[PDB]
Every structure is written in C-alpha cells, then in structure tokens.
Design an enzyme around this catalytic site. Structure first.
Site, PDB file in Angstrom:
ATOM      1  N   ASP A  12       0.849  -1.194   0.000  1.00 32.25           N
ATOM      2  CA  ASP A  12       0.000   0.000   0.000  1.00 32.25           C
ATOM      3  C   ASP A  12       0.887   1.247   0.000  1.00 32.25           C
ATOM      4  O   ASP A  12       1.811   1.403   0.818  1.00 32.25           O
ATOM      5  CB  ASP A  12      -0.879  -0.065   1.238  1.00 32.25           C
ATOM      6  CG  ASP A  12      -2.027   0.902   1.291  1.00 32.25           C
ATOM      7  OD1 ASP A  12      -2.268   1.534   0.324  1.00 32.25           O
ATOM      8  OD2 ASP A  12      -2.482   1.193   2.389  1.00 32.25           O
TER       9      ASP A  12
ATOM     10  N   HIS B 234      -3.002  10.732  -1.074  1.00 35.80           N
ATOM     11  CA  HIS B 234      -3.132  10.217  -2.443  1.00 35.80           C
ATOM     12  C   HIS B 234      -4.616  10.264  -2.804  1.00 35.80           C
ATOM     13  O   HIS B 234      -5.472  10.464  -1.961  1.00 35.80           O
ATOM     14  CB  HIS B 234      -2.548   8.806  -2.532  1.00 35.80           C
ATOM     15  CG  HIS B 234      -3.125   7.867  -1.554  1.00 35.80           C
ATOM     16  ND1 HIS B 234      -4.292   7.164  -1.776  1.00 35.80           N
ATOM     17  CD2 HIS B 234      -2.776   7.601  -0.268  1.00 35.80           C
ATOM     18  CE1 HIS B 234      -4.635   6.513  -0.710  1.00 35.80           C
ATOM     19  NE2 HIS B 234      -3.680   6.682   0.230  1.00 35.80           N
TER      20      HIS B 234
ATOM     21  N   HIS C 203       1.355   8.785   5.105  1.00 34.12           N
ATOM     22  CA  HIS C 203       0.352   9.769   5.466  1.00 34.12           C
ATOM     23  C   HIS C 203       0.858  10.676   6.601  1.00 34.12           C
ATOM     24  O   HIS C 203       0.563  11.906   6.582  1.00 34.12           O
ATOM     25  CB  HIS C 203      -0.955   9.155   5.938  1.00 34.12           C
ATOM     26  CG  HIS C 203      -1.791   8.684   4.822  1.00 34.12           C
ATOM     27  ND1 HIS C 203      -2.557   9.566   4.102  1.00 34.12           N
ATOM     28  CD2 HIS C 203      -2.053   7.441   4.352  1.00 34.12           C
ATOM     29  CE1 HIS C 203      -3.168   8.903   3.148  1.00 34.12           C
ATOM     30  NE2 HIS C 203      -2.923   7.611   3.314  1.00 34.12           N
TER      31      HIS C 203
ATOM     32  N   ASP D  71      -0.531  -0.329  -4.997  1.00 38.28           N
ATOM     33  CA  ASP D  71      -1.845   0.125  -5.321  1.00 38.28           C
ATOM     34  C   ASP D  71      -1.803   1.562  -5.875  1.00 38.28           C
ATOM     35  O   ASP D  71      -2.609   1.915  -6.754  1.00 38.28           O
ATOM     36  CB  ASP D  71      -2.818  -0.013  -4.163  1.00 38.28           C
ATOM     37  CG  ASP D  71      -2.393   0.613  -2.846  1.00 38.28           C
ATOM     38  OD1 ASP D  71      -1.316   1.228  -2.794  1.00 38.28           O
ATOM     39  OD2 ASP D  71      -3.198   0.505  -1.947  1.00 38.28           O
TER      40      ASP D  71
ATOM     41  N   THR E 281      -7.022   3.316  -2.107  1.00 38.69           N
ATOM     42  CA  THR E 281      -6.611   1.958  -1.852  1.00 38.69           C
ATOM     43  C   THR E 281      -7.600   0.953  -2.428  1.00 38.69           C
ATOM     44  O   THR E 281      -7.227   0.072  -3.195  1.00 38.69           O
ATOM     45  CB  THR E 281      -6.387   1.695  -0.352  1.00 38.69           C
ATOM     46  OG1 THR E 281      -5.388   2.629   0.009  1.00 38.69           O
ATOM     47  CG2 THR E 281      -5.889   0.312  -0.059  1.00 38.69           C
TER      48      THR E 281
END
Ligand SMILES: *[C@@H]1O[C@H](CO)[C@@H](O[C@@H]2O[C@H](CO)[C@@H](O[C@@H]3O[C@H](CO[C@H]4O[C@H](CO)[C@@H](O)[C@H](O[C@H]5O[C@H](CO)[C@@H](O)[C@H](O)[C@@H]5O[C@H]5O[C@H](CO)[C@@H](O)[C@H](O)[C@@H]5O)[C@@H]4O)[C@@H](O)[C@H](O[C@H]4O[C@H](CO)[C@@H](O)[C@H](O)[C@@H]4O[C@H]4O[C@H](CO)[C@@H](O)[C@H](O)[C@@H]4O)[C@@H]3O)[C@H](O)[C@H]2NC(C)=O)[C@H](O)[C@H]1NC(C)=O
Ligand SMILES: O=C(c1cnc(N[C@H]2Cc3cc(Cl)cc(Cl)c3C2)nc1)N1CCC12COC2
Ligand SMILES: [Ca+2]
Ligand SMILES: [Ca+2]
Ligand SMILES: [K+]
Ligand code: NA
Ligand SMILES: [Zn+2]
Length: 799
Positions: free
Chosen positions: A119, A418, A263, A306, A157
């Site tokens: 991820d 994102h 993040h 992803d 995601t």
C-alpha cells in the site's frame, strides 16, 4: 457463538458458516474468531528467527516458528532456519540465475503465483530507497520490471486493489472511492465499519473467484490488520506445504506500509526509511522461506503497489464555504477529490448548474476544478456508476478540498495523501514480476494496472472474466503462457461510390465560389492513387453493422457514415516539409456537394444557418491542403462536422498550428480524426437512438467529443510515411463543449490555453476504439501483440 475451537483449523481456507466461530485470516475483522484463535493461530513465543542455540531443538508447539529437525517436513520452520542451522545463504546473497523452466517439487501441477502487494508504494521508491531494499532490488533487476505502473482514478486503496483483482475500472467494479453512497440500496460504504463487508458493493469477478470456478485453489487475499506480517508470510509458506489436492496455486500478501507512515510523514520524510527497510525484510523472509521449500525457482512472484503518495498538508486546503453561500445544502465527499450531492433529495431548490458556476474559475490560483462527471477526461473512465455523484472536483496535486474549515481542525496532523488524477507522477506505483514465467533481466514500458488481471490469469492458466484490460498487450512481460489474440473480424464492409449525382440534385442551402493533361490526374486521386500515403496502417475496421462509404481524395481518405451523415474517421499524412496555408477569402463560407453521396445522406448548410448555437468545422483541415486546387476537396459537405463556436477555437488552433508543429517535431505524422457520441457516458459507442442533440431541424447528430490519433515513426530519423520499425502514437478525446469554462485562461490567445486543454484530454487508442467501434492499425509490419501495447499507450505529459 465463539465456544468452538481453532484446533487444527488455523488459517483455514474455507470460511465456515455462522453461527460457527471462524479461524480464517479475516475472522478478527468480523470479531468472529473462536475463543482460542490467538493462543493457537497467533503464536509469538521466541519471535520469528532461529538462533544458533535453537538449531535442532526439541519441537515446542508454543513457538511462533520452529528450528527443530522436523520443521521442513511440518512446513513451519522460521524462514531463516536453513541459513542459521544448515550453513545456507540468504536468497538475496545468491547470484541471479535465469529461470528458464519451472523447477518445482513433484506434485506441483503449475507454478504457484504469489502477489506481494504494498500500500502506498510510490514508483520512485525503487530508485530512491534502493540502498535499503536489497531483496526488492534483486527481484527488480533479475526479473521483469516497469519503471512505473499507472493506477486507476481515484488513486485510493480499495478502488486500486479491486482493479488489480478484476481488471475493471472502478466505475464497472463499483468500488468508486474509499467512501460511497449507493442511492438504490440507500446504503453507505466506509473504511471504518461493517457495510463494506456486504458483497453487494463488489462487482465483477475477482481473481480468487476466477481461479476457484476453474478448479484452481486460492489462498484468501485479505488479512486482518492485527495479524503481523511475519505470521502472514509463515501462513503462506504453510499453505504451500499442504498436500497436492488441498494446496492453493494463488496467494496474496498485503502490507499497509509504506502508506501508513507516508500519510504521517510525507512520501520522503526521514521516517520513511524504516518502513521501506521493514518491507524489504519481509520480502527476504518470503524468498528465504521459498528457498527452504525448494520453491524459489518454481513460484512466480509479483511485487505490486496500489498507488503512490504526495506531499499534502492541512494548510493546502480549499474550502467550499469560500465559494458557495448555500454550503449547508450540500454533502461533500472531501479530500484529494470532491464529490458533491444534495444533502436532502426533498430540497427541489438544489441546482447543480448554480453550484458548478459558483466553483468555476473564481480565484486566480484555484487548486481544484469542478466538472459534471460526463465532462471529466475520458481517460479517467469515471462516470458510469450511480455511486459517482454528478458533480466532481478534480483537485490539484498537493491540495485538499473540504466543505468548511471546522471539518479540518475538528476531525496539523498529516503530511501525505493520495487520490489525485492517475496521470500524476507522485501517484504512480510499482510492478515487478519474478519467476519462471516472467522474463529475465527485462525492463518493460509503464502500463496500466487494469492489464494485470489478464496476466495473472495467463500465469495460472485461467480464462479471464470480461474485463477492461487488452489481453495480449502485456505479452512482452512473459517468457511463456503468452496470449495469442486474433484481430476482431470487420462487421461492415464499405461501399466505394463513384460519381452518381449531378450538382443540381442537391438543395442543401450551401454555396461555394467555384485542363486535359491533369483531368486524368484528379480522377486517379478520387480512385485512391494517394491512399498509400494518407492511410498508412490500413483502413480502420468497423466492428458493428452500419452503412458507410470510403471516400478518396488527394490529401485525405475518409470512412463516411450514411447513418450519422459524417465521417467515422478521416485519415491524412502531413510530412515534415508540409506547408500551412490560409483559407482564401472567396472560400470562407464555401461548402460543396459531394457528387459521390446522395443528397439524402448529406448534411445541409441551412440547418447550420438556422441553428443559432451550432456552427461547423472540417475533419481534414483546409489549412493543410497540398495545393490550391486540392483545397476544394476540404470544403466537401462530406468533410463537415458540427462544432460549437467555442470549440472551433480549440479545433482551428489544433489544425492550423499544432498538426504542423507535431509533423516538424516527429518527422511527419499521420492523423486520424473523427467524432465520438457518448451521451450515456459509458465509454462505448452510442447507437443512433441514444443521441440527445441534433443540429436544429435536422437529423445531423451532435458529437459529444472529437478524437485524433497522431502516429509517427518511433525512430524519428525516418519519416512517418517510410517507417521500417515500431510506431509512436499520441491521441486525444476532446470534449465538444459550447463554452470554454473548463479553461480559466480561455479569454487569452489559444497559444496560452489550447494545448494544455488537449494534454488534460490525452487518450489511448483503445479508449477511442471503445468509443467508436473502430479497430485501428490493422495493416502494419508489426506483431499484433506489439500493436496491442501501442493501442494501450497513454502520452501523459508529466515532467
Ligand atoms: C469494462 O469491462 C466491463 C466488463 O466487460 C464492461 O462492462 C460490461 O458492459 C456491458 C454493456 O454496458 C454490460 O452488458 C450488460 O449487462 C446486463 C447484465 O448485467 C448483469 O450481469 C453481469 C454478468 O455476471 C454482471 O457483471 C453485471 O454487473 C454490473 O451490475 C452490478 C449491479 O447490479 C454490479 O455489482 C457490477 O459492479 C456491474 O455494474 C456495472 O455495470 C452496469 C451495467 O450492467 C452499470 O449499470 C453500473 O454502473 C456498473 O458500471 C450485472 O449484474 C444486461 O442486462 C445488458 O443487456 C441489456 O442491454 C442492451 C440494451 O441496452 C440489450 O442488448 C439487451 O436487450 C438488454 O436490454 C434490456 O435492459 C436494458 C437495461 O436495463 C433496458 O433499458 C432495455 O429497455 C431492456 O429491458 C447488457 O448486456 C456488462 O454487464 C458490463 N459488466 C460489468 C462487470 O460492468 C465495460 O463496458 C468496459 N468498459 C469499457 C469502457 O470498455
Ligand atoms: O485494508 C485491509 C486489507 C487487507 N488485506 C488486503 N489484501 C489485498 C491483497 C490483494 C491483492 C490483489 Cl492482486 C487484489 C486485492 Cl483485492 C487484494 C486485497 N487488502 C486490504 N483490511 C481487511 C480488514 C481491512 C482494514 O480495512 C479493511
Ligand atoms: Ca492504499
Ligand atoms: Ca455510450
Ligand atoms: K449556426
Ligand atoms: Na474559460
Ligand atoms: Zn493511504
């Protein structure tokens, strides 16, 4: 009813039916595991690594993993057992050696596939973090890798993971964001909570279902967050030790990193080194584990992300409260994209058009752009789902959109996010394939993640369910198991009309101010003598039933629809040496009947005169005529298409300035241009009964979009029209709009805004194929797989 037991059931593959308690890799997420799941299934004692003092120990079943002599046959050794205890090398320390054939244990029917999904793993981590990811770097340099892999929009995601699983765009699989409202269900899907587990959200057919239906067993792909990575790996390796009739052939690992840390710290925060090192160590555990089981030259491994991760801070937030006065009458899905709907379906006062206008070009550096979903770039394929709100905000990279300031400080914290446009460099992610079925030490061009389902099916010998990949486009990744597609059969054969009508049979309201040696000459042109120059890759094939005519001219060839009263396609070649000319004054309003095509199958000028909103343009540009006399051909009624004046500013600049620019940069170009009708925004050619707008008082349909496919030689030392080798293509699908509200600088000269518009609406040839029912590049000297790769190419214009 958690009073059952996981004894002998740890990580069982068939989840069992309530109200029996569960022992599978998702039971935790449903708070449904048997009472003894942690004790039995999530052992941690003594950690994850053999040490010299454990070597040959007596088996203690409490230990997380084993260093006892019996562990290889039980399939539960710590992954570093052979290294610590039997003088073996870690996989990463072994030289790369080509895997020409699968080298598998007896009883393996096919090489297993293991998908190692990460991820938030941004593409540039492969170079920027290379010093701290030795295992990943070996997979990458020894296997097959792309410089990057393009995610789908939105670059969130679950939309991307499920696209990896299905080969479908989010509009089709139905996972259109990480949060959603479905008005038919009247139900909401969110990250936190239980509604997202309801199967009605999840459309198409994911890989594990495709495998199971075709008799290939699958490991469960989803892991509860609390299961540690080391246990996920050990669980895969234990499944790989099952008896032949019980053992899966396809498996997935998932890591929440580096997204979680990205993040908090931004994509390149100093804190990001450790997460990348930890992922690499996890790859090392898997590869060492495979090597112990003699599977390291048997299994195909995919290392795939992803989406990427961008720098985004609380201060770079735009607030809708700074634009709307009515902010309490809307619901916003916020962040790195915006989706707007009415707070109440009982408010008949709510007006989309007034919300769009209040959000359009209102502040000089506005960091978002509003769109009705049907007006979004077609390359996003983001409209044909009831879960996608009509109003959409495309948010600039590095920014967020929120309803009101209090949404941002009553919820600074985060430094990465994102979700942006899938063309944005920071959103790109990774692909590596390593194994017997992948190529050795091979770099492949960037490709879209919608293509991987087909390849994963190829790797497992499965027939893929219908999907949005172009099967064969990624054959160049594979040593074996390639998919040998055949070109689609032409459905409609063209008519080739000669001269059949006298000028006076036409009553179209058109006017135009208009030798023996070269009377023969222009007859030859009308018969197709220049067609080899202007039609370089064969006639496009029409893949549906219709009535159309091929029309030849000196400078261009067209496929003219008798049903839509205009060309489906117009093909012309412009050499590097070509000259641009003007439209002569006496020819400004010239439109000429085409004596090959009946009056009843022609457009008429009076309709355009009567329609006060609608003007016309031409598909083959009069500006690029080869000679004053050839120019007359460009004013044929058969070369005319309906165009709003606002759009003609775009089109005229393309035709007058940009085509020549491209020919001089690329050493000639071949251009195919035409209309597109997609009134139901499904990405597919409209039938005639789907058309919502005609030129007033006529049967002349109005396109929703205009396309161009611009092809040249990849080796630009050769001219487009004498190219011996691979091709180079760029394409667009421009929205046919009555205003230029999308372009905030449109009051300026076209040189300041038109090309940036066209870049935003870049497209793949395949996008145009879907939208037109045409099949291009039918007669080249190239392999069909190579042409499929060309048709999937997107020119992104990122720096
Ligand atoms: C990307 O690849 C995909 C996959 O190939 C392409 O999508 C396919 O496109 C086809 C055309 O749009 C479409 O075919 C139609 O399907 C209808 C049967 O649908 C069900 O069955 C399949 C098979 O298992 C299933 O996959 C479908 O799944 C959808 O719906 C559920 C929700 O119920 C979702 O969970 C799932 O996410 C998926 O949703 C998506 O697709 C639907 C449309 O099906 C959209 O509405 C959603 O927004 C979302 O995008 C279904 O469960 C079938 O009934 C259709 O046949 C009718 O249509 C024409 C005339 O219009 C005609 O030939 C028939 O006579 C028939 O007409 C009658 O019905 C009309 C419609 O109600 C009615 O108006 C008439 O008056 C008649 O009564 C049609 O065959 C196929 O389903 C999808 N599949 C998928 C997975 O999306 C996609 O096009 C590709 N994209 C691009 C750009 O290339
Ligand atoms: O978030 C995840 C999660 C877990 N496991 C996984 N596994 C991946 C691996 C993979 C590979 C491909 Cl090719 C395709 C798909 Cl769809 C998948 C799913 N993903 C997310 N969990 C499940 C509980 C929560 C926390 O919130 C929901
Ligand atoms: Ca993610
Ligand atoms: Ca359509
Ligand atoms: K007009
Ligand atoms: Na404008
Ligand atoms: Zn994230």
């Amino acid at each position: 009813a958690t009073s059952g037991s996981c004894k002998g059931r740890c990580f069982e593959l068939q989840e069992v039916g309530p109200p029996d308690c569960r022992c599978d890799n998702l039971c935790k997420s449903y708070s449904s595991c048997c009472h003894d799941f942690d004790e039995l299934c999530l052992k941690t004692a003594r950690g994850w690594e053999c040490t010299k003092d454990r070597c040959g120990e007596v088996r203690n079943e409490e230990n997380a993993c084993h260093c006892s002599e019996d562990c290889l046959s039980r399939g539960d050794c710590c992954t570093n057992y052979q290294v610590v205890c039997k003088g073996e090398s870690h996989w990463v320390d072994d030289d790369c050696e080509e895997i020409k054939v699968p080298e598998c244990p007896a009883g393996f029917v096919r090489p297993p596939l293991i998908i190692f999904s990460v991820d938030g793993f941004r593409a540039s981590y492969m170079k920027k973090g290379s010093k701290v990811m030795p295992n990943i770097e070996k997979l990458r340099s020894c296997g097959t890798h792309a410089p990057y892999m393009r995610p789908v929009y939105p670059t969130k995601t679950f939309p991307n993971l499920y696209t990896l699983a299905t080969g479908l765009y989010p509009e089709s699989h139905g996972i259109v964001g990480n949060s959603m409202y479905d008005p038919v269900f009247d139900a909401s899907f969110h990250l936190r909570g239980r509604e997202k587990f309801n199967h009605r959200w999840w459309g198409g057919q994911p890989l594990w279902i495709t495998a199971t239906k075709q008799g290939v067993r699958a490991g469960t792909f989803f892991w509860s967050v609390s299961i540690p990575h080391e246990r996920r790996i050990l669980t895969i390796l234990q499944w790989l030790s099952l008896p032949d009739n019980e053992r899966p052939s396809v498996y997935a690992f998932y890591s929440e990193q580096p997204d979680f840390s990205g993040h908090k710290y931004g994509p390149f925060g100093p804190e990001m080194t450790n997460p990348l090192r930890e992922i690499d160590k996890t790859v090392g555990q898997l590869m060492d584990g495979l090597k112990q089981l003699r599977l390291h030259r048997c299994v195909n491994v995919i290392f795939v992300g992803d989406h990427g991760m961008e720098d985004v801070t609380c201060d770079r937030t735009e607030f809708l409260s700074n634009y709307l006065t009515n902010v309490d009458d809307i619901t916003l899905v916020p962040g790195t994209l915006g989706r707007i709907r009415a707070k109440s379906i009982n408010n008949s006062k709510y007006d989309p058009k007034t919300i769009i206008a209040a959000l359009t070009c209102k502040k000089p550096d506005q960091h978002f752009k509003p769109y009705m979903k049907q007006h979004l770039p077609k390359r996003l394929h983001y409209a044909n789902n009831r879960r996608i709100e009509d109003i959409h905000l495309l948010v600039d990279r590095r920014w967020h959109v929120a309803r009101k300031p209090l949404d941002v400080y009553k919820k600074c914290f985060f430094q990465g996010d994102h979700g942006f446009d899938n063309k944005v460099n920071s959103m790109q992610t990774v692909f590596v394939g390593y194994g017997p079925t992948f190529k050795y030490r091979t770099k492949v061009p960037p490709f879209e993640n919608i293509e991987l389902y087909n390849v994963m099916c190829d790797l497992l010998g499965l027939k893929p369910a219908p999907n949005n990949g172009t099967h064969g486009s990624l054959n160049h990744l594979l040593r074996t198991n390639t998919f040998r597609p055949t070109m689609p059969d032409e459905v409609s054969r063209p008519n080739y009309p000669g001269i059949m009508y006298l000028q006076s049979e036409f009553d179209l309201g058109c006017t135009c101010d208009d030798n023996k040696l070269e009377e023969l000459n222009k007859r030859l042109h009308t018969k197709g003598s220049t067609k080899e120059r202007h039609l370089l890759y064969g006639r496009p094939a029409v893949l549906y039933r219709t009535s159309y005519d091929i029309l030849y001219h000196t400078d261009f060839e067209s496929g003219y629809s008798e049903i839509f009263l205009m060309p489906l396609w117009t093909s012309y070649t412009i050499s590097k040496q070509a000259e641009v000319s003007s439209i002569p004054e006496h020819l400004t309003n010239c439109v000429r009947p085409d004596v090959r095509v009946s009056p009843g199958f022609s457009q008429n000028c009076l309709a355009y005169k009567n329609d006060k909103q609608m003007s016309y343009g031409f598909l083959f540009p009069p500006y690029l005529s080869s000679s004053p006399e050839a120019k007359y051909d460009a004013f044929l009624v058969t070369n005319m298409v309906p165009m709003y004046p606002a759009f003609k500013r775009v089109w005229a600049y393309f035709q007058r300035v940009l085509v020549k620019k491209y020919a001089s940069e690329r050493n000639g170009v071949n251009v195919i241009s035409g209309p597109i009708f997609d009134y139901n925004y499904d990405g597919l050619r409209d039938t005639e009964d789907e058309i919502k707008q005609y030129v007033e008082g006529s049967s002349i349909p109005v396109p929703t979009h205009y396309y161009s496919i611009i092809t040249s030689c990849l080796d630009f030392t050769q001219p487009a029209d004498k190219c011996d080798g691979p091709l180079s293509v760029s394409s667009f699908i421009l929205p046919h709009r009555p205003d230029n509200d999308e372009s905030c600088n449109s009051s300026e000269d076209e040189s300041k805004w038109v090309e940036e518009l066209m870049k935003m609406h870049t497209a793949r040839v395949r996008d145009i194929e879907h939208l037109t029912g045409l099949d291009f590049y039918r007669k080249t000297s190239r392999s069909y797989s190579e042409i499929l790769t060309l048709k999937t190419y997107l020119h992104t214009y990122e720096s």
